[PDB]
Structures are given as structure tokens and as C-alpha cells.
């Protein structure tokens, strides 16, 4: 129930703001005074501290937190050393931001609980949108299977779900349609799709992509 | 097989370049750092050392040829800004740019950036939902209220059937898939069973899902 | 009636001193303490502040000023970001100093009310004096027409305005003559011109330049 | 067709070089930065990379050939100073130098600079008159007391004649020109009309003009 | 005649390289500083300028050929760390690394360093025993309790025999050697004499030796 | 009885900790505040001071100490100048850490009492272990003679000291055997040696090395 | 009677110490706090001040001093600007240290009362000692004439002034002989010169140098 | 025609080099800065870019050939120190070195510098005597008590004879020379006259001269 966020960068700042917005106890820690002041209004508490300094860590009472997030990026040494201190303080859950393949590996070795690559991961998602302008967002069930949110084109305007027989034609299933903000869940065969609506389809990627090539 | 130009081979842009090329697209990698160009040389169609703030070098790249130009310059906001400005004045159709903060976004907005992205900001949200709720593995939002969520089944859910968990009536949700031992099951029948540490895909309203988590899981 | 001058450089310093000299309420703002102290005696109020910091801007009560001048030069990012903050604070009149063609463009895009290029503009004026040692100062009515202040040579000593029939000979009109500090406005045909006096002529540039080549 | 040397291709000196050359004069652009030389190469007769504090490189430029040498070095006051000192000792006829502050002016004065210029200081004054008085577009001072001013006509002045506005008797001033829609009118007759957002050129004493502004406009 | 690679030609690694080569071993000296490579060129089998954090340059060295690779990078802990990480992933049998502090040791421990060394830390102890006890010249610890010590004989011990100093019965220790004027004596007989400023080698328990020092010396 | 340690680096830090552990009066001196704070708990007293500043030296009352250790490394000039000040303050025993051959020489010239090369010296010791994996630790009696601690191999398991007739076969003598932590001093001819035990041998290096080649 | 020394470097420090030693009122001014503290005991007053800052100059009451010495070296701009401020404060006597030929020239132009080149001047003196090991010290009366202090060699031991008929042989005159510290002024013809004594000779340089070549 | 090596072409060493060469001596100028070497190239017999802390480059200079080596390195005390140390170990006969402070002198003293010089310190004294006493132009000290001084004659001394000013009896001093309008007079007769703004050379005890100044001048 107690969260600590060390390193109030673009990543950690988002985490801190979002966690706090959910009504959780969040401690924001940063070496820069300007940052601390900025996120003071976004954290339960905001304290200036050097996280590579063990005494300051104890001063924070950091052992009390079940989750501690190290979102230090540019200074790879600081990121590494901070996590190490935390593990030696027997912190249950330590999530750390990684800068490259090698940074992930050392964090792996020293007992980080979960390592994240925000930029590397988003890069993939956006690339998928670049290659395929139709795709708005998606989630991968596996290497082969995914759920995709498509932006309906002119070709689909005023067409029905039975008209788009994705179950037989593409082996897929329509999960939702979003029109002008209104949402429809598990839509009936009588439901109509208009242009520039959001269409949620489920199935194998190649089957979905094929629906895009032929259908959309 | 469109033509992409990627300016700024950082953690973000690097991923884009590697991923775009992997799909078999024509991608030009451009960076001011010579060491980077060598590194991503094996991942791009062409890799060229260039300063994107330099108009002559920009024309030398033949940037007019590209329908999509990606500005993935982060740390140097002025360079990020100045690059986009040149690109807009070169009448590039689609200019996608990485933003560092709220104000960087606004300036990119004003000078006519086509798509602005906040990788860290967006991931912060995604990760935060997992921090607050260890059960959620991944998700997608259909709207402000409705979302599709991938759940990690607990001991509490072991060996239970979909008809036993009538989420359609009890929680107004629907199970979309179950992933067991790597094997995947789509549109599972009411007789299908769920075991612990499997991946469970549920669809519905946020509050309805969270309630299922508190009571079911 | 309320003026704010941010960035007390060579440009802003001149503005601040000159505005204050006219008896206007001027707030001088600079990140450098030495500057603030220096222009303290030249401003109504002088306050140390980082203009890229939004809270300090509100602390200044900058919304209260009808005119805010951003005279930050070297740090182009600061100049840009400051103006942006001001526009988002709905400041009526925002005048900003530009460093180059590109800086003008972004300031243009983000809603600057007037953009100025002090060095670029003066460069032209001085170049005109370099090419033509006779010219002291001028103003352009258009691309073709201008009013010019000439330094009278030996060729013009003790000559009259009717003797210099600029209305017929060059299609121009003499507006003023300055002798030893004494000024003459709308001078009569009987007025005499002595060497090293200031002569103010009006007409087309080529006609004026021709008067210089032939007359002076 | 005199010979000009321009040392310091900054915002100021750059303008000078571009403008002088545009008039068809022989201009030599000299700068310590190689990137600058390339940039202004297209705007100068000759463009040479050189350190103006280096006497041998100075002679290599053949600076003795120039009747006018412009020192437009600003930020580096020592370089600005040291360049002028060399030039004076090379018996250059006319040495014009950019000054950064009051004291820089004094030293340039003492070592025999022929013309010292304060671009920002001078513009500050010009701009300030427009800030305090939005009606004034541009102006020139005949003396400490008398000036010629270009005014932006308001709604209050729309469709009024010059004889209706007898500024010669009422304010002791004279209208010199009216600019309408780009079209220009010189020495306008008393029957000539002025419409809003036109350019109005008035001549007289400062207080007389300002009074006309308060009452007329 | 094993194969050694020495990364980091510092005070520590430099000594290693010089000493290993002196014994007639194949040693490859590798350093990022070009000046260093030249300096230790005369002390290594091969001397190559290389960045040990660069994987391609690492393979170029043929580091796989070496059974022993010594990371003697100190000041730059990230480089020290990153080098070891690469080496472990290249499946190098024995990787010995210099540590700067306690935490640097831990990370080296976790990523599978085979031997970690603390030269300054270890010497600090050795030197400290001489500071506190000027009589001890050098020593070796058999355990936490038992050690072998080299003592500097005082005036108090001059011309005394080993049978006169029955350290075996009186202190439970044994004299192992006496060094006189450079001449060395091993397993000295009970009749052997000790003169001042000679080197005396004693073996036993720490407290027993120190007591002999207080009473004997 | 009074010790001063100037320069709390890796070397000096070890000295300070070890001297203090022995229950000696130790004054830790460092220019860095973080260091001083760190070794505050390891020194009798810890004081921030610049040792190149003579007044601060007198302020420490440094004349009172019989032993002063200068463990400044990176800044060779500071190391040199500090020692010089100390000698001019007539300090009895001044021990100084050296960085290179040349630093030793100047310290030699200005009257340092003992000069130490920690890294250079350890380099030799470790190299001996690299070349000979059997060697754990050693001490040199001279250029030729040494006492060596060997790690017993399979070849020596369950063998006796008379079986290893080092007195006749190699002209050496066994001094101790360490088994599972238990130690044996001046071991009897009946004593057994098991694998991975610690074996202490005394004699000429070549004789010992030969025992390793043939015996072990 | 009032002296100010700005810039407590090697040059200014010597001046300040030497002037103060003579019992004069000396104000030491330096931007570096450590310097100020150091020369505090050597000045009547020692004050931290930036001499390029006009207000601090007035704060010192620098107009009160008849002599102000600017001994700023490395920062040529500071040296120049300081002197300029002083001249504009109408300081009677302004002595300034110069770094090069060009620095002398600008100081010349802005009204420095005396400009000094300590290093350049000493360089000559020492060079004269290098070329001629016999010369200890000297003073030039002109380009041709000088007074020289010579170190007597073996060739001159136990020789008399009439024996060294410098008035006829070399056209010179002996002014003094220094033996073991004892000094002799206007020495008589009976005075003896012993080896390694100090001999003071007056005349033309070439005549003196010739005496060295032939006599000494 | 001895052989001189000059390390450190600063204000001090530069003067030495120029002056030594002017007298027609073989002088080798050595400096780490390439720009300096070019500058003093015209003033030295040979001018070579070299790092004096580099032993190999030092031998490359053939520094053993020189009987005199001048270390005129100031700012970088470690380089100044390290250079001298190398030179002493190369058994150079006479090593003259510039000192920056008291402690730099001591270290140079200890490592066997043959002559140590304090240009600024020495000049400070000379200049100070002129500051306190505007009448003195230049001087030389015979000892702690006795000195020879060059005085600037005032109005008070105009048209006075040497017999009128019997400094030999009245002040125990002697006039050595009078310089008038550039013309010089040595061993002037008692009938010789002194006019204002001439140069007057007086010899004697410091207090005797100063007293003559107070009373005579
Ligand atoms: N030693 C430290 N202790 C605590 N906080 C630190 C330390 N070093 C850096 N930080 C903080 O961590 C924050 C994030 O670091 P930084 O912004 O350099 O990483 P980044 O790669 O830019 O991350 P992002 O991708 O989120 O922008 C910074 O705000 C910084 O103040
Ligand atoms: N003017 C320029 N011209 C060309 N390339 C540039 C320019 N400025 C920066 N870059 C390149 O852009 C790349 C991305 O910038 P950088 O990685 O510093 O941003 P970042 O905030 O760290 O992004 P990420 O979050 O992906 O780490 C850099 O590798 C740099 O080489
Ligand atoms: N972030 C900031 N907030 C407020 N003031 C700033 C900031 N950054 C710089 N300034 C101030 O703006 C002033 C002008 O900037 P600067 O002098 O570098 O521009 P410049 O190009 O030299 O302008 P000029 O042409 O007038 O000399 C400086 O005095 C500086 O103190
Ligand atoms: N020693 C030198 N030799 C030759 N060129 C020089 C030297 N020093 C500076 N310059 C050049 O002078 C140019 C003008 O200087 P700079 O632009 O820094 O002055 P500024 O105050 O910024 O002027 P502006 O107000 O025009 O921006 C610089 O572009 C620089 O390349
Ligand atoms: N990335 C790298 N690749 C190759 N060599 C490196 C790298 N980083 C550092 N080195 C080299 O490692 C050497 C040793 O590092 P350094 O001497 O700074 O450590 P140290 O703590 O000073 O060790 P010592 O105690 O021996 O002085 C340096 O000489 C440097 O040239
Ligand atoms: N002028 C000074 N006065 C006092 N202490 C100083 C001074 N300069 C440096 N020190 C201290 O000396 C300590 C050791 O110096 P440093 O660590 O740079 O040497 P090192 O070569 O790294 O030594 P080691 O081999 O022990 O790591 C540092 O902690 C530093 O704070
Ligand atoms: N702006 C300033 N105002 C006052 N004092 C200053 C200023 N800048 C420098 N100084 C002082 O002037 C002193 C002399 O300057 P510096 O030592 O750099 O010249 P230098 O060439 O080394 O002179 P020297 O030949 O005597 O060693 C320094 O102690 C410094 O603190
Ligand atoms: N390691 C080195 N090898 C060769 N030359 C060097 C080295 N270090 C310094 N020098 C040269 O010595 C010269 C003199 O040093 P520097 O002029 O900085 O001393 P300084 O105190 O300024 O002397 P001065 O009082 O004459 O100005 C410098 O020009 C520099 O080029
Ligand atoms: Mg990032
Ligand atoms: Mg400017
Ligand atoms: Mg070390
Ligand atoms: Mg000097």
C-alpha cells in the first residue's frame, strides 16, 4: 500500500502523477530541487535526496515501502547503485527503468524485480501505426495473436457486422465499435459501422492485416 | 513499402528504426553521432551521419523523397524543434515528433507537427496500473470508461469454468481469451477451464472488472 | 500603462531605460543578480527571476502588464519558452527579440505580437552610411521612397534652396536645414545652406542619390 | 565601389555584409568560425576563414587594401578591442566598430576608432517610442526637439481632409506623405483624404505632434 | 605460458603486466589511452589501443583466446563494470577485476567475476600494522589468529642467542630465519646469534608474538 | 601514540579504519565533506580541511601527531605540497602514498620518512597468483628466498609430511597446515594433508616452484 | 601618502608586502577570498572586491588614494577595465602591470601613468647573467653605459686596485669591494681584492666586458 | 657561445630567449604550445614543439648537449617541477628555474635546482621603492645597507654645482654620473652642473641618500 518513486524524470513523473491520481501513498524523491518543488503538488510527500547515499535512504525510511520505483535514466551508475542499495535493504518489489540492453542485464543480476524499457516498447507500438495508418492501438496475446483497434474508412461506412463476416471471411471477431464517443460492447449482427469510427477486432495478426488489405 | 526517415537514433527512434525495417520498410537512419550511425547501420536501409539542423545536409539527404519523417530527438529540444521547423517548411506530408514535456508539445503543435508522442508519459500510466494492481499484465482502453484487460489468474480462480464465472451476467463483462503454458485459446467455450498463472483476457467497464478482481480473484 | 521588460541585455536594457525615462511603470526582470542591481536604479522595480519558470512568472503578477518585452538573446530556448508562457497567460501585447530567421518563425507560430531584429535592421542603416558617407540618417516610406538627412559638402556652401531647384532638377523637396544646432522647418526659398550643415531631402531614392552624385 | 572588410559575421556584421554586397560593393567577409564563412560565402565577394587577432593572418588578408574595415565582433570584447588596435596600427583610414557597452565604447574611442555603433541601444530607443505610443510606426530625429514621424491613422481620422486638419496652423506641423494600400502620395494637396490604417507622415516639434495625437487621433 | 589479457593499464594493472611479462608469460595490454599503450608497449607481448566497452573492438582483440582476462579499470566504475559484463557473456574462464569500493565489489560478485581484488584496502591493513608497530617489517596471516611476522631486531636483542630466547617455550613461537647484512639464514640453529638491524622471522599466535615484542624487544 | 590520516581515499580509508580498529587515536582529514561524514564513525575525530593550506594545518594542531599519513593520490601537487608543509612543521614520521616513479622521487627529495606504492606492490603479488594458481599468499625474505602458502591439490590428499620429504627432496620445510579452518603449527612427521588445505612451505623459490611442478 | 594595490598576484603581492614593510598605508584588494586572507597580515586593510565593478570601487573609497596599482595579469580584460574605471575616477597616479606588447598599448591609450613589464624586464637581467656568469647585478645608465657588480675570480685574488689599473687599462673606475659581507666604498689604491668577493665597476659595457675577457 | 635550452616560452622565458639570441648565443626554444613555437621561431636558433614532461621527447631534443637549461614554466607548477626533476636526472650541469611561490622554490631547492628566480617578487621590490619615492628611477643594492641610486633632479637642484652639493662631506655619498638630454657624463668634475629632469647617480648608505633627498631635493 506504500509506494516510493525515485527519479522524477519523464518516466517517473508520469508514474508518480498517475499513482497519486489513483489515491495511493506516493513518496517522490529527486536530487534536483526544482523537480521536487514541481511534483510536490503531485506527491503525498516530496523530498530532496541523493538515492545513491545510503544514509539518506534510511532517512526516508525507505524500508517501509513495499514498492520502490527507480526511474533514473541518464546516470546509469546512479540507477544501478540505487537498486543495489534497495535490494540490500530487503525491499520486496523494486521496479527499475533501463537505458539499454546492458543496463537491463546488470539490473537483472543484482535482483531487480521488474525491469522496464519504456522507449524501446513504445517504439514498436508507434512503428506499427506508421506502417499501418489504420491502427490506433493494440495488445498482443502472443507472438502471433493480437487485439487491434482500427479506424474505419470510407469502405466500411454504413456497413453491418454480418456484412463484414469476419468470423468466416477472416476468422476474426468484432469486439466493439466506437461512434462519436459512444461505445458498443459485444455488438449485435445488426450494428452499423460508420466512417472514422473505432473498430475493435480480435484474431490472428495476418488474418487481421488481410482484412485491412481487402476489407478496409 | 512507404519511405521513412528517422532523425534521432535514441532509445525511442532506435526501436522505431529496428522495428520498421524488420517489417520490410525503406527506412533512412540519420544521426549527428557517428558512433550511432555505425550501430544502427545493420538495422537501416541506409545510415547517414548528418546534422538535422543543417538545411544543406537536410537537402543532401533528399528528405523531400520521404512521405514520413520521424523526429526522435529528445534531450536537445532546440534541435528537435529546429528539425521539425525545417521539415514543415520543406512541405513534408507527415512529420512525427517525440516530445519531452508539455511545453515542447505546444511548440510542436503550433509549428504544424502531424503527430506528437509521449513515450515515457504513456508508459508511466500503463506501468502504474500494474503497480497498483499486480494482477493486470497488459491492457488497452476503448474509451475513458471502457477497456480490455489481461489478467493473471490466481489460486482463487484455479480449475474454475467460464460458466461458473458468469462474468457476462455477474459483472457484465466477457472473457475473450485464455493462454495456458504458451498455448492460446480464442473465444473460449463456457466449458473451458482456467488454471493458475494462466493469462486471462477480460472485456468491459473498468469498475466492473476491478470489482470482479476484488470478489472473484 | 504597465510595462514589463524581461531580459536586461543590450536591447532590453535600452528599452527599460528609455521607457522609464518617459515616466512609465517598468518592471525589469533578469536571471543575473548583477544586472538586476545595475538596472534597479533604472526600473520602477527590479526582480531576480527565471522567466522560464511559470511560478515565478505568477509571482511577478505578470498577467497585470499590458506590454511584456522578452529581450533574451543568446539562450534561444529561454526566449521561445518565455513567450509561450506569456501567451498561455493571455498577455495582450508580447514583443520579443529574435536572433535569427528561424527564431522569428517559431515566435511567429506561437503567437508573438511583434518580433524585432535589432542587429539585422541597424546593419542595413549603417551599410547605407558606409556606401554613402553623405547620409546621416533616413526613413523609408516604401521600397522606393525615403526621407534622407544629408551632410552638406563644400559644393553646397552658401547656396540657396532655389539655387538647388530640387523640385524641378531632382523632383525632390527640402524639408529642413540644421546649422550649428539651429533648426529650420519648411525653409523658405531665400534660406542659405552652409557646409557641414544637415540637409533633409524628400523624394525617390534614385532621384536623391542622383542629387548626391551631381549636386553634392 | 569602395573596398570594405567585414570582421565579425554576427547578426550585425552579417546584415552589413549582405546589404553592402547587394548594393554592388566589394566586400570581404572574415570570420574565425569556419561554418560562418560558408554561410556568408554566397553573400560576400570573398569569404575567408581568419583570426583577426592574428597579425600574420591579418596581413595575409591584405587588409591594407581596404579603405573601410568593419569590426563587428561583439561578445568577445578583447578580440573586438585587439582587432581594432591592430587595424589602427596598420593605418587603416576608416575603422568602424560595434560596441557592447559604455566602457567598450571608451576604449574604442581612446585607441582611435573612427565610428562606434550601438545597434541594440539605438533600437531600444526606437522601439520604446512605439511601445509607449502604438500610433508611431517609424521616425527620424532632426534634433533633440524636432523630428519626423510616421503615424498610423485611426478611426478618428477616417475620411478627413488635410485642410480639415490644418496641422500647419493648429499644431505648427506639416503632412509630408500619405500611404494608402501600398500606393504612396508625396506632398499631398489640401484636398487629399486620409483613411484608417494608412501611413501618415508628419513633421514638426515632438510636443506639437504628440498633442495632435491626443486631440486629433 | 598461459594467455593473459590485461584491460586497464593503471598503477595496478601496469604492475601486473610488467610482472607477468617478466616471468615470461604471453600478456596482451589493452587501454583506451594511446599514450599508455606506447608506455607499456615495451613491457607487453602485444600492446593495442582499444575501448573495452566496445564489443566489436573486443572481438577484434580476440579476447576469446585468453583463459585469463584482467579488468584493472578503477576510476571509471561503469567501464569496469561494463567490461566484466561483456567478458562474462563471452564465456571467459577466469575474469579478475579490480574493485574501488564495497558496492563495486557486490555488482562484480553478482555478474560472475571470478576474483575481485582490493589493492588499497589490503595494503592499508598491511601498512597499518607497521604504523602501530614500527618493529614489524612484513607479514603473512595463516588465519584470523595465527601469523608469520618479520621483525626488526633492536638494541635490546643484540648478540643474543636463539637458545637464550627460547621463544618455543617462553612464547610458544618459532624463529624461522635471520637476515644479516643481506646474507640470509634459514632454519637457524640454537647457537645462531642475532645482531641489531637484522631481519628476524618469527611464527606463532598474534598475541604471543606481540607479547614477545613488549618483553623481549 | 597520536596518528593523523590525511586523504581519506581507498588507501587512507583502509589505514584509518584499521588503525582505529586497533584502538588508536586517529584524526581523519579530508577536503570532501561526504568523506568526512562517512569516516566520522571510523575516526576518533573527522575534520574538513584543505591540507595544502598551512593555517588549517595549524588549526588541526597537526604538530601534535607523531605519525601523519598523506594518502592523497589523484592530485599529485596536493600530495607533494602537503608533505612539504609537514616537514617544515618538523613532523617526526611522515608516510606518503605515491602515484608513480616520479612522485616517489620528489617525495624522496623533500624528506618523506616512508613512501608506499600500494597498487604497484599488490600488482606483483596478484601476478604471482595468476601465473601460479596454487599460490594463495607469500612473503619474500630476499630476492631469492620466500615463504609460500599453497593450496593443496588432489595429488597431496591424505599424504604425510615424511611422505613429502621436502627437507631432502626439495630442501624446504613445512611450517603449517590449515584444514577446514583448523590450524597446525610446526606439524609433526605424522601429520596428514588433505586436498584444498592450506600448506605453508619455506625455502628457495625455485625449489618451491619445483615442488609445485613435480609434487603438486 | 595613501596606496592601493589591486590584484594580489606574484607582482602585486610583492609590492603590497614591500610597501607595507616601509610603513605605508596600503589597501590590498583581491577577488579571491583566500588571497585576501593571506595578505590580510601584510596589508593595512584587506578587502574582497571585484575591481571591474564600479560600485565596489566607490565602496572602497578608491578616489582617496594617490597611488593605485593594478597588478592583474591573466585576465587582460579585467586589467584594462579596472584602469579605465580609475582614470574616470580621476586617480592621480595609476600604475599597471602589462602582459604583452598589445596590453601595454591599450593601457597607454587610456591614460595609465606608468606601465610595467616585470617578467620581460627581469628576463634581460637574468640573460645577462646566463651569458656572463661573472655578473651578479647591474644598472644601465644608457644603451652604452652601465654599472656592474662582478664576482671576483682566482685571477684577481690578492690583487690591488692600482694593480688593476682600470682607469687607464679599461677606462673604468672601481666603486666598491665586498669581502665576506664587509663593504668598502670609494676604495683606496691600497685596497686588496680576494677571490669570490663582489667588485663594482663603472664604465662603458664593451670596456667592462673586455676587462672580464682579459683581466678576470 | 655556450649552449642554452629554454623550456617555457612565457613572458619571462620569452624575454630570455630573445635577449640571449640577440647577444649571439645558441638558444633552443622549446614549448608545448605550437603557436608559441611559431612566434619565437624568429628569435631562436632552433624552435621545436615538445612536452618537457615527456622523457622520450626530452632525449629527442638532445638536452644532454646543453650546459644550461632554463625552465621557465610558471603556471603549471607540476610541469615546472617534473621538468626540473628529469633534467637533474639527466645530469644537466646548470638548471635555472622560474618559481611561482615560496613552496615551489623549496621543492626546486630540494631536487637540486642550480638557480631559482622570482621575477615578480624581485620587481615588486624595485617598483615599490619608486612608488614610495618618486625621485628614484633605478637602483642596485651592494648590500643590506649600502646601495647605488639613480635620482631625478628637481627644481630645487637646478643649476647647482657638485662642489655646492658636497655630498661626500655633507652626506658621505659620491656622485657617479649625470645624464643630460641623453648625453652622459661619467665621473663628473666638481665644476659640473646639474639641471632639472636630468639623471643623477649617487652612491652611499641608504639613510644617507634618503636624507640628502629630504634636505637637498
Ligand atoms: N543520484 C540521484 N538520486 C536521486 N535522483 C536522481 C539522481 N540522479 C538523477 N536523479 C533524478 O532522476 C530523474 C530522471 O533522470 P533523467 O531525466 O536524467 O533520466 P531520463 O533518461 O531523461 O529519463 P526519462 O526517459 O524519463 O526522461 C531526474 O529528474 C533526476 O533529478
Ligand atoms: N541537430 C541534430 N542533428 C542530428 N541528430 C541529432 C541532433 N541533435 C540530436 N541528435 C540525435 O538525436 C538522438 C536522440 O536524442 P536523445 O537520445 O538525447 O533524446 P532522449 O530524450 O535521450 O531520447 P530517448 O528517450 O529515446 O533516450 C541522439 O542520439 C542524437 O545523436
Ligand atoms: N531564463 C532567463 N530568465 C530571465 N532572464 C534571462 C534568462 N536567460 C537570460 N536572461 C537575461 O537576458 C538578458 C539578455 O540575454 P543576452 O544578453 O544573452 O542576449 P544578447 O543576444 O546578448 O542580447 P543583446 O543583443 O541585447 O546583447 C541577459 O542579461 C540575461 O541575464
Ligand atoms: N578573434 C577573432 N577573429 C575573427 N573573428 C572573430 C574573433 N572573435 C570573434 N569573431 C567573430 O565575430 C563574430 C561576431 O561576434 P558575436 O556574434 O559573438 O558578437 P555579438 O555580440 O553576438 O553580435 P550580434 O549582436 O551581432 O549578435 C562571431 O561570429 C565570431 O565568429
Ligand atoms: N572503456 C575503457 N576501455 C579501455 N580502457 C579503459 C576504459 N576505461 C578506462 N580504461 C583504462 O583503465 C585504466 C585504469 O583506470 P584508472 O587508472 O583510472 O583506475 P584507478 O582507480 O586510477 O586505478 P589505480 O588504483 O591503478 O590507479 C586507465 O588508464 C584507462 O586508460
Ligand atoms: N587538498 C586536499 N586536502 C585534503 N584532502 C584532499 C585534498 N585533495 C584531495 N584530498 C582527499 O584525498 C583523498 C584521496 O584522493 P584520491 O581518492 O583522488 O586518490 P586515489 O589515487 O584515488 O587514492 P586511492 O588509490 O586510495 O583510491 C580523497 O578522498 C580526497 O577527498
Ligand atoms: N576582477 C578582478 N578584481 C580584482 N582582483 C582580481 C580580478 N581578477 C583577478 N584578480 C586578482 O589579481 C591577482 C593577479 O592575477 P593573476 O595572478 O592571474 O596574474 P598573473 O599574470 O599570474 O600575475 P603575476 O605575474 O604577478 O603572477 C589574482 O590574485 C586575482 O585574485
Ligand atoms: N609540460 C610542458 N612541456 C613544455 N612546455 C610547457 C609545459 N607546461 C607548460 N609549458 C609552457 O611553459 C610556458 C610558460 O608557462 P606560463 O607562461 O603559463 O607561466 P607564467 O607563470 O604565465 O609565466 P610568466 O610569468 O612568464 O607569464 C607556457 O607558454 C607553456 O606553453
Ligand atoms: Mg527517455
Ligand atoms: Mg546583439
Ligand atoms: Mg589506486
Ligand atoms: Mg608572471
Residue numbers in the entry:
A (entry chain A), C (entry chain A), F (entry chain A), G (entry chain A): 7 to 222
B (entry chain B), D (entry chain B), E (entry chain B), H (entry chain B): 6 to 222
Provide passages from the article that reported this PDB entry.
KtrAB is a cation channel with a nucleotide-dependent RCK domain. KtrA binds nucleotides, ATP or ADP.
We introduced the single-point mutations R16A, R16K, A80P and E125Q in KtrA and tested their impact in the complementation assay. The structures of R16K (at 2.7 Å resolution) and R16A (at 3.4 Å resolution) with ATP are very similar to that of the previously determined wild-type KtrA-ATP (WT-ATP), adopting the square conformation. A simple indicator of ring conformation is the pair of distances (L1 and L2) separating the Cα of N38 residues located in opposite subunits across a ring face. In the ATP-bound rings, these distances are similar in the R16K (30.8/30.8 Å), R16A (29.9/29.9 Å) mutants and wild-type (30.0/30.0 Å) structures. KtrA mutants that show a wild-type protein function (R16K and R16A) are able to adopt a square conformation with ATP. Importantly, they also reveal that, while R16 does not play a major role in the mechanism, A80 and E125 are crucial residues in the adoption of this conformation. In contrast, KtrAR16AB-ATP is also active in the choline condition without added Mg2+.
